[PDB]
Design a protein around this nucleic acid. Structure first.
Ligand SMILES: Nc1c(C(=O)NCc2ccc(F)cc2F)c(=O)n(O)c2ncc(CCCCCO)cc12
Ligand SMILES: Nc1c(C(=O)NCc2ccc(F)cc2F)c(=O)n(O)c2ncc(CCCCCO)cc12
Ligand SMILES: [Mg+2]
Ligand SMILES: [Mg+2]
Ligand SMILES: [Mg+2]
Ligand SMILES: [Mg+2]
Ligand SMILES: [Zn+2]
Ligand SMILES: [Zn+2]
Lengths: 367, 183, 367, 183
DNA sequence: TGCGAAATTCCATGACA
DNA sequence: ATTGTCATGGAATTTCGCA
DNA sequence: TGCGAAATTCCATGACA
DNA sequence: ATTGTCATGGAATTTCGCA
């Protein structure tokens, strides 16, 4: 009333342009605008109007305003619209993001063999000799790979396989995803007794285990080819696949994982004989030169509409296994620490501290 | 001649029989001639079948040019000869009753016998679980002749488990009392 | 022998450069090249050598050659390598493509309402009043949408729903995917009795039904928001969702599907009143102007490494539901006709004629 | 005054009882006042409950400003008044025993009665399946006053099912014989 | 004939099993 | 015999209110 | 000091549940 | 408290064989 009372008689109020005539009709303040005659509601009604229009179909900024503008006009309508969108809990947790993640990191290759292992499970596969799964262990520096068939992706089967592997050498770090077999306390106990630091991927982000995941692709691709036109009896092929892939050249490196681990081919077909006249000490000297000079990619260009996390920002974590007709996003949470441009710590929806990948976050819209 | 390299020659031999440990009685010893690196595989018998199963594991990691052994039955069989021929492995045998390998390999096989004996006493049926730490110890043992350990000669790096506390390898007088009690 | 005999004595043979000395050793023709000494095998052995090296791990061009080059050299090695790769059946049906499809078509919007319907099923959903599925029917021109709850995605439930819908109007064309409910002869019989032409998408390509698929996203998104913090009782909400989405503005069009179908808002909240003083005939005249002038997108730019189909080309269709450790691609087939840059007819692996999308094809490598 | 538009006024009325057809006895007729477009919903009774169920279907497509009806019990109930108030629909009633709608609507309701009667005879229990084709016929019928059909006035286009063969709508003399036999 | 702010348009992003 | 689609919210661009 | 062909490198594409 | 990866085959670029 008070603000709109002075408008009818002809005073200037900030926000209401002067060149339009504001009249009264049906007990309502109106205005003649180029689109047509619109009602100017009092300030105390506008929040309710924006809410009624939004709740029709929980529409975004422009689709909600186009409803309101059919009947009403007032100064800076979209500001009141955006204020409601930032307060609508259902839209915040249901809507999709329209900003991409920042470009991926390319972590430095481990300097030495047995500095970092990457492990993961493939399966379930067609039963072969009662075995359903395969434990894949990949050395980060060389790409050298060990395969172990198991009957379940269990902690017990993981310990049995790694005890056979660590007969050769003990690694500094073992990296795994947060699967049940690797997150159990039994597995942490097994690692601490051997001086092995367990490193875990951020949850629901297999990119982080990409070294062993990419090797899983090659293992399955070779098994597929070897089993063409045959029953899928893969148990007997694992030693063949293991040896074949470990002695396969990486076209970008110009070396096989066997060569990067040992510096010399064993008695395999087409063995390289370039270092035949060097001594072993001369050979190992050339091997240290080869390991340090391997090709390493760099971060790609950011896409034109990416976001990067800032401390104190409102972000929402992706719901892991969302049920049917349930929101895809958790409620807003705050970024505590930025570990790197792609990894952050947040104050969880329950109250905990949680380390997440930026790919499983969206920035909360409308601040 | 060409310098000696890893995988040029594996030396294999059986150790046993031993007290049963989870159903296993023997140990297949494989030693790389150049590096002294050692692999240990427990078997239920010194047969061609158990040898082929153990070496199928090892040869999925690396294949030697030559395998050297004594004239044991498991190694002189035609099944083992066919197995070696399929993988391009030349078999090489010592004269009967004159086992000759090499000084580095002789002393390594000596270390394995005495290191097994020292850890057998007190827990004679629990050696199956100890084979991993036995291999680590053997492969990270300083060589007197060469400057480096087997691990260093094979991978060209230092190890994450060095064994600086070089154990005596001899039997203490109390271990002679409990060893003289049984067998 | 014959070709290599003249080489040892010193004659020139095409392909073998002259500046290198070709000698004999261990009964084998050799050559001193910058990398080292290599064996030159006779012509009759080379196919077998390339095959032995490839079959180690069924490697591609460079990874296979790097094996061969450790021991051998001969003129134009990669030609013999590529010849084998094109003949290896296992690699052709197992390997992935590395060429993208050509840019998508943006079919012209149907000119009139009821010219083309798009129909599809959503489900299964959480049980609500014994109903598990929803039949979604979208008019191509307007986007106006009808929702029908069903207990199965069956032909019987489709006919019952469309009989209620066609009380309003009969469409010229009904477009659907190749689901079981729409491909049955009972449904074709129902359509021919009413003069409705049935149009089907290429198999396993829901892009082609993209108009109704995109509407499925909006339906589920609104249902999700309305059911936040409630049991998923969606049966009673379908009429609400239907009305809400049909009266929701498309920000790029500046119109709601209701407005495009009727040219006037009904008694809904925030109804537009711009045409209040026009007659209905003046209104329908403006409606025909609005329908023809709607925004329409164009084909995007092709990616830098795309392929487009040519008549007579060897292509392979993607296996639909491939089993574990089985190839992802069918055996090579030939392109009979190019219906458009994104759709072709091929001579199937069985012998039939099959109409497929280019997204479910790869061009066979190595010709 | 403002020109007459679709959805300005729906006219509703019940037709029945009829011979049972898949358990249905009545027909709710809804006619748009401006276009003459007609919706037909079969019900089991002329109750407020069956009216609300049928109109909930129609009002999920389009909501009228005004609903006009006679003083039937189903339409004068306070349940139906609460239903109309929730959707912003003004209810409008004719005087008892003086049903007045409009000339266009009167003649349309006349067409529906006679078109139902003509297709009832011969197959009196199978009218539930015929309601779709009845609506198509009614909504694609040429208007004498206006130049266009109800379909054209509502959607602004020609229809894919025009009904050029304008059926006589009268009863043939043989249909009088079979109609005079039953009821 | 030009300025600051508001309004509008642009458009990459992602999800429809 | 067939073919992607479009709501979303920051950013980019255009228009408005005033001079 | 330059040409045609071969060899090599480049790199977008897609799949690891 | 953590992080994508790399085989593949056409295309682009460099190198080779010869003059
Ligand atoms: N989903 C899993 C994938 C997977 O999806 N791989 C495909 C894939 C997709 C993309 C990409 F870049 C690489 C890539 F390999 C996987 O590989 N592993 O090993 C898993 N292991 C266990 C669990 C269950 C959840 C455990 C706790 C997670 O926090 C799931 C997964
Ligand atoms: N898979 C099916 C999808 C689907 O995957 N949608 C996600 C999706 C992905 C990408 C995209 F661009 C749009 C998009 F909606 C689907 O929507 N419908 O309706 C189906 N209906 C039936 C069958 C079973 C096979 C029937 C014969 C097919 O030839 C599968 C699907
Ligand atoms: Mg995993
Ligand atoms: Mg995995
Ligand atoms: Mg479908
Ligand atoms: Mg679908
Ligand atoms: Zn909302
Ligand atoms: Zn192959």
């Amino acid at each position: 009333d008070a603000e709109l009372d002075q408008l009818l008689q002809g005073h200037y109020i900030k926000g209401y342009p002067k060149q339009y005539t504001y009249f009264l009709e049906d007990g309502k303040v109106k205005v003649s605008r180029p689109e047509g005659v619109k009602i100017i509601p009092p300030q105390s009604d506008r929040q309710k109007i924006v809410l009624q229009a939004h709740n029709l179909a929980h529409t975004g900024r422009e689709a909600t305003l186009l409803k309101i503008a059919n009947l009403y006009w007032w100064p800076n309508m979209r500001k009141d619209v955006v204020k409601q969108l930032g307060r609508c809990q259902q839209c915040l947790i249901t809507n999709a993001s329209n900003k991409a993640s920042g470009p991926i990191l390319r972590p430095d290759r481990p300097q030495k063999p047995f500095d970092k292992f990457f492990i993961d499970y493939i399966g379930p596969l067609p039963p072969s000799q009662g075995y359903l799964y395969v434990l894949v262990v990949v050395d980060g520096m060389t790409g050298f790979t060990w395969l172990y068939p198991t009957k379940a992706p269990s902690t017990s089967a993981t310990v049995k396989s790694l005890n056979v592997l660590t007969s050769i050498a003990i690694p500094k770090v073992i990296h795994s995803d947060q699967g049940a077999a690797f997150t159990s306390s039994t597995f942490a106990e097994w690692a601490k007794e051997r001086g092995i630091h367990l490193e875990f991927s951020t949850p629901y982000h297999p990119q982080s285990s990409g070294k062993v995941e990419r090797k899983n692709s090659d293992i399955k691709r070779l098994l597929t080819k070897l089993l063409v036109g045959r029953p899928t009896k893969w148990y007997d092929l694992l030693p063949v696949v293991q040896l074949a892939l470990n002695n396969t050249y990486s076209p970008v490196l110009k070396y096989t994982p066997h060569q990067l681990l040992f510096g010399i081919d064993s008695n395999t077909p087409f063995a390289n004989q370039d270092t035949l006249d060097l001594t072993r000490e001369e050979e190992l000297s050339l091997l240290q030169e080869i390991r340090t000079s391997l090709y390493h990619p760099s971060t790609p260009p950011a896409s034109s509409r990416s976001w990067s996390p800032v401390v104190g920002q409102l972000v929402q974590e992706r719901v892991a296994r969302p049920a049917s007709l349930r929101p895809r996003w958790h409620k807003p949470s705050t970024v505590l620490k930025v570990l790197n441009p792609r990894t952050v710590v947040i104050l969880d929806h329950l109250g905990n501290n949680r380390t997440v990948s930026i790919d499983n976050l969206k920035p909360t819209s409308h601040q | 001649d060409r310098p000696q390299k890893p995988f040029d020659k594996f030396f294999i031999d059986y150790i046993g029989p031993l007290p049963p440990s989870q159903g296993y009685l023997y140990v297949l010893v494989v030693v790389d001639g150049m590096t002294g690196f050692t692999w240990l595989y427990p078997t239920k018998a010194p047969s061609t079948s158990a040898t082929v199963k153990s070496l199928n594991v090892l040869t999925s990691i690396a294949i030697p040019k030559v395998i050297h052994s004594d004239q044991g039955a498991a190694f002189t069989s035609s099944t083992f000869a066919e197995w070696a021929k399929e993988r391009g492995i030349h078999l090489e045998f010592s004269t009967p009753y004159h086992p000759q390998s090499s000084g580095k390999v002789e002393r390594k096989n000596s270390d394995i016998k005495r290191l097994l004996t020292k850890l057998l006493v007190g827990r004679p049926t629990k050696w199956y679980d100890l084979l991993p730490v036995v291999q680590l110890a053997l492969n990270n043992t300083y060589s007197p002749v060469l400057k480096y350990t087997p691990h260093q000669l094979l991978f060209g790096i230092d190890s994450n488990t060095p064994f600086a506390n070089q154990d005596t390898l001899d039997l203490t007088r109390e271990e002679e009392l409990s060893l003289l009690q049984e067998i």
